[PDB]
């Protein structure tokens, strides 16, 4: 699949190391030659070692080999395809009939499925199938779960997007608090759920829930090796601000919240800016 060998040779040569420097104590010269020739599958352990030898990041090497873009597999394509269909509705149908059937194939597929459902809901397309099954789908998917992976938090984020909060909450509660970090991607999705969930809580005025998500997020900051997302920190902090304004009625809070919204415009995050503005406008009403 991925040309890891050639990336190794590439880096090996840029840094002026000889084959010997890499294989010495790990494999025969002949074998290593196969490795760089990409004619021999390399083991995670071996790759890890060559990585230390080269002095270049293991994950970076994998990325350079082709583990980046989602095109690495079917599921990846399907996901890229979504955003395409988002802007080109007409596409929907065609695909949705291939996806929908396999929505319970893997956590990855269910997420994509919810992706389509999100598009339809935006352009008001008919999705009778969805309404007649999610409840059952979620039951099947999470009834006897005990440990959650990134994809689960990804699912819950999209879930919160195409269903009433009340239908999703039951599934969230047992997924927090987080106790460990399992990579940038993992850290990212766990934060996204909080951000979306807190936003919904504020919009619907459920201050007890809002309170909860704010604490969950704050707790994340206490975790070793956790990568908090700055933009999320800003947005969640603006929500905290609004929260405090809705409760303590503190004028200062409203001011801070507005300063944060301003900052997004300043640093150029226009999309986010418009969102929070329309979100604040709304909050001073519904």
């Amino acid at each position: 699949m991925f040309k890891i060998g050639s990336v190794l040779k590439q880096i090996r040569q840029e840094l002026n190391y000889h084959q010997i420097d890499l294989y010495s104590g790990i494999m025969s010269k002949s074998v290593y030659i196969k490795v760089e020739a990409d004619s021999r599958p390399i083991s995670v352990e071996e790759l890890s070692k060559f990585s230390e030898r080269l002095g270049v990041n293991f994950f970076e090497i994998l990325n350079r080999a082709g583990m980046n873009t989602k095109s690495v597999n079917e599921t990846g394509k399907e996901k890229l395809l979504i955003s395409k269909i988002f802007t080109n509705p007409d596409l929907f149908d065609k695909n949705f009939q291939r996806i929908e059937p396999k929505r319970l194939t893997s956590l990855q597929y269910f997420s994509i499925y919810l992706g389509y459902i999100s598009i339809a809901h935006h352009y008001n397309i008919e999705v009778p199938t969805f309404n007649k099954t999610i409840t059952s789908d979620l039951k099947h998917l999470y009834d006897k779960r005990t440990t959650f992976f990134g994809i689960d938090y990804e699912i819950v984020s999209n879930l919160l997007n195409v269903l009433p909060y009340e239908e999703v909450s039951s599934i969230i509660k047992p997924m927090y608090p987080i106790v460990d970090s399992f990579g940038k991607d993992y850290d990212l999705t766990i934060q996204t759920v909080l951000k979306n969930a807190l936003t919904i809580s504020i919009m619907n005025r459920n201050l007890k829930e809002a309170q909860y998500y704010i604490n969950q997020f704050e707790h994340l900051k206490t975790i070793k090796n956790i990568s908090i997302n700055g933009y999320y920190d800003l947005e969640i902090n603006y929500l905290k601000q609004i929260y405090q304004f809705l409760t303590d009625k503190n004028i200062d809070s409203y001011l801070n919240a507005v300063n944060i919204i301003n900052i997004f415009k300043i640093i150029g995050k226009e999309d986010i800016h418009r969102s929070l503005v329309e979100e604040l406008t709304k909050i001073s009403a519904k």
Partner: peptide, 7 residues
């Protein structure tokens, strides 16, 4: 805001 994440 209510973000959609696809990884």
């Amino acid at each position: 805001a209510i973000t959609l994440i696809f990884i």
